Design a protein around this ligand. Structure first.
Ligand SMILES: Nc1ncnc2c1ncn2[C@@H]1O[C@H](CSCC[C@H](N)C(=O)O)[C@@H](O)[C@H]1O
Lengths: 216, 17
């Protein structure tokens, strides 16, 4: 199984419109765009992000899939964003939908924001924190915080883990891979997603730290 | 009064599929 680069929208105006929905949602939350992990003051240094600290180990991203990741990042940088649209929904808040076809195994985005110790975030009200590193020593555990800086990943919806039929809404998956010895969090399509289809993944895919009883 | 903190988590083994 190999990661696939996304196919960005052929129409330049369509890519502009897409990028604009993300810009609007970021501006709405008073956030700055960041397509990388940021290591801020009074938070975690880049040195703290070391994959050998993962309790039980972390799978390594292969050379083939790293080139795929770099290819997607270069595309984002040049202007070829993934074919995603940020759309406000009254029942979910901001959501992400496919604004083009996304085949199975296609790289969607990296989960970005500020990396901080879980110990500095135990009572943080941010509705979008994501576990980065789960260390044996709980003072070494890290969390991604897209409260001030972040990308599209933080707007992607989750499934209700309590309903009999909610698992059916899941069309993408959040995995953690080792890249140059560091922890990285990625989103990948788990099935062929059509234009307009809402992206959903399991927020409780390893731990069960996110309350989903009320999700739609 | 009591302060609680929601966190997403992802597997670090098993690949995508
Ligand atoms: N399936 C679902 N049903 C209802 N609310 C959901 C949901 N998936 C995500 N959410 C909402 O999104 C939050 C996670 S952060 C995702 C972005 C967020 N909706 C925003 O507007 O910034 C959850 O705490 C919940 O408020």
């Amino acid at each position: 199984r190999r990661l696939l680069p996304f196919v960005s929208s052929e129409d330049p105006a369509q890519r502009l419109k897409q990028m604009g929905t993300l810009a609007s949602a970021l501006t709405e939350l008073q956030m700055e765009f960041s397509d990388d992990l940021t290591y801020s003051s009074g938070m975690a240094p880049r040195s703290a992000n070391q994959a050998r600290f993962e309790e039980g180990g972390m799978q390594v991203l292969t050379k083939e899939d790293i080139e795929t990741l770099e290819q997607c990042r270069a595309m984002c940088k040049r202007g070829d964003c993934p074919p995603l649209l940020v759309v406000f929904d009254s029942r979910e808040g901001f959501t992400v939908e496919a604004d083009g076809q996304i085949k199975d195994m296609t790289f969607i985005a990296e989960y970005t924001g500020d990396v901080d110790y879980i110990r500095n975030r135990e009572h943080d009200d941010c509705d979008s924190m994501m576990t980065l590193l789960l260390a044996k020593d709980p003072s070494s555990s890290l969390v991604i915080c897209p409260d001030k800086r972040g990308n599209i990943a933080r707007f992607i919806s989750g499934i209700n883990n309590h309903t009999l039929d909610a698992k059916k809404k899941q069309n993408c998956k959040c995995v953690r891979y080792s890249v140059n010895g560091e922890c990285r969090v990625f989103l990948v399509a788990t099935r062929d997603i059509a234009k307009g289809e809402r992206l959903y993944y399991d927020y409780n895919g390893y731990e069960h730290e996110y309350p989903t009883q009320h999700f739609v | 009064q009591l302060a609680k903190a929601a966190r997403k988590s992802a597997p670090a083994t098993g690949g995508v599929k």
